[PDB]
Amino acid sequence: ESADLRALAKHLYDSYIKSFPLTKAKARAILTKSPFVIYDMNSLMMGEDKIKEVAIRIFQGCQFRSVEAVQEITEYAKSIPGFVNLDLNDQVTLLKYGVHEIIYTMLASLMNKDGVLISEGQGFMTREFLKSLRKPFGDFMEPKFEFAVKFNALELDDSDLAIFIAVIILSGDRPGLLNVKPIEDIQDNLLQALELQLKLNHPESSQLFAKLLQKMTDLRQIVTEHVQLLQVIKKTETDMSLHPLLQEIY
Amino acid sequence: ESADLRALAKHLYDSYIKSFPLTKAKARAILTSPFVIYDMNSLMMGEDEVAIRIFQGCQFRSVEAVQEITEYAKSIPGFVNLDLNDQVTLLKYGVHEIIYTMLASLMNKDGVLISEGQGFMTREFLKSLRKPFGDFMEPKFEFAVKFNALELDDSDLAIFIAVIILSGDRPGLLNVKPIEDIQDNLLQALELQLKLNHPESSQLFAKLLQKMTDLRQIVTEHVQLLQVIKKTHPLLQEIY
Ligand SMILES: O=C(O)c1c(Sc2ccccc2)c2cc(Cl)ccc2n1Cc1ccc(Cl)cc1
Ligand SMILES: O=C(O)c1c(Sc2ccccc2)c2cc(Cl)ccc2n1Cc1ccc(Cl)cc1
């Protein structure tokens, strides 16, 4: 029956709002109290005032905020009906891989073709400034921006993304999973949830479900580059430290 | 209205049984099948440091518990109509007070029900621990003995725990008016329920409102201990 899921879709929006303070809705407003834009070396030196080299400072900046994003997605995951009940060793597995795919989804919410929100929306930072960095980091965030723009085209809601965020973490198709059946069953309901939500919220985006499920192809492909790229920067610069929570995931 | 109150009582009760798989009725039934843990040796058998592993299962369950509490607060009339920030606050603080209340329904003098009922840890086993954990649950056991002496049923608890949840004095509530507004309602319902289901028990109502002073005691003191437990996985620490 519908109300089964309609109400499940509600439970998850409400947790979504309660777990991530920068929503797609809040970003879209501040991308159309305006952000301080950074598009040059010095505008970064203002960015300190207003809100080791730059490419390394700015990389370590992506890392702190991601340690706090991983915090946010754990909080959200606990909320998902079933997840807390599952095997403990697999909870840790689902997050270990389920995190990054979530990140570059929420990322897209903060992105347009031109750049990316920063410091909780306080600032903006160009897609072309980023390209113009130090040899390893001049390619740090480029495919993100590419996928951001194709992914954002579906023009998803927050309420949509909350169920899709759910489906992601509860994969089953993940490496190291002892009990796969109960994961895959939670997801059968989340997919069932998601299906009706895309019909109702976006009644024109025909095969939006299909076209959304399709973007999990793009998403892993992104994670793969980030991993081996992230793996380089350790060899280039063993001076750099990583946060242990980020270590675990990686 | 004498009839409205009897309605809130039932809506709350009903939601409570859906919300909580293991009732105090059937937890009492069990207590008088369950695999007991009384030795170290029973333990390594029932699984199929050691002081650490036991503490940390209390953890995994304590987090399952939280979720079924959040599910249950949903059905409290107009709970959801509250400011979402305020919902988070009420749950955040009340959750612990309701865990020991429900941990009473699993406890008797000599130990506590385990694994959603399939087990029984001796109270004397629990007492027989290391200084970091050898009087961990000892305080708890005294609360539940005195608490269970009020012979509340789940019909009463289901109204009682709703009231814990909406206690309007929590740190950081933004709009306290409706929070107390509902609590006034659940109080009015709990009065009628205690006076109906136990007309023999005089001032039971008054006596339940004092154990809430105990609950706030046992919860700060437990807080105090899970920071003393910080004087002895990164992704898992974050889970808890
Ligand atoms: O501090 C920040 O919030 C920040 C930073 S770090 C920073 C912020 C202000 C001045 C200097 C550095 C960042 C760096 C990149 Cl290359 C991309 C996004 C960044 N952000 C925003 C952000 C980072 C990660 C995620 Cl998952 C979402 C938003
Ligand atoms: O998973 C359980 O059912 C359980 C546990 S979990 C456990 C069982 C066997 C060995 C180690 C941990 C538990 C531990 C303690 Cl020191 C006290 C009560 C405990 N329980 C009963 C319990 C029921 C509910 C909640 Cl909120 C917390 C604990």
Contacts of A84 in chain B (CB under 8 A): 63-64, 66-67
Pairing of strands A123-126, B35-37: unpaired
Contacts of A88 in chain B (CB under 8 A): 60, 236
Q: How many CB pairs under 8 A join A and B?
A: 45
Tally the domains of chain B.
1
Range of the domain at B22: 1-240
State the nearest Cα–Cα gap between A110 and chain B, in angstroms: 23
Does an H or E element contain A214, and which?
Answer: helix A208-236
Q: Which resolution, in Å, applies to this structure? A: 3.2
Residue with tokens 């997050």: A95
Which residues of A contribute to the annotated binding site for rosiglitazone? Answer: 63-66, 100, 226, 250
Selecting from A18, A78, A85 the residue whose C-beta is nearest the C-beta of B84 gives A18
Tell me the CA–centroid distance for residue A118 and ligand 1, in Å: 5
**Nearest-CA residue of chain B relative to A14?**
B84
Reduce the secondary structure of chain B to three states and give it as a string: CHHHHHHHHHHHHHHHHHHCCCCHHHHHHHHCCCEEECCHHHHHHHCCCCHHHHHHHHHHHHHHHHHHHHHHHHCCCCCCCCCHHHHHHHHHHHHHHHHHHHHHHHEECCEEEEHHHCEEEEHHHHHCCCCCCCCCCHHHHHHHHHHHCCCCCHHHHHHHHHHHHCCCCCCCCCCHHHHHHHHHHHHHHHHHHHHHHCCCCCCHHHHHHHHHHHHHHHHHHHHHHHHHCCCCCHHHHCCC
Ligand nearest to the CA of A43: 1
Selecting from A70, A84, A95 the residue whose C-beta is nearest the C-beta of B64 gives A84
How many beta carbons lie within 10 A of that of residue A78, not counting itself? 19
Cα(B149)–Cα(B118) distance, integer angstroms? 24
Closest approach atom of ligand 1 to CA A118:
21
Residue A11: give its domain's CATH number: 1.10.565.10
Tell me the CA–centroid distance for residue B72 and ligand 2, in Å: 20
Cα(B155)–Cα(A234) distance, integer angstroms? 60
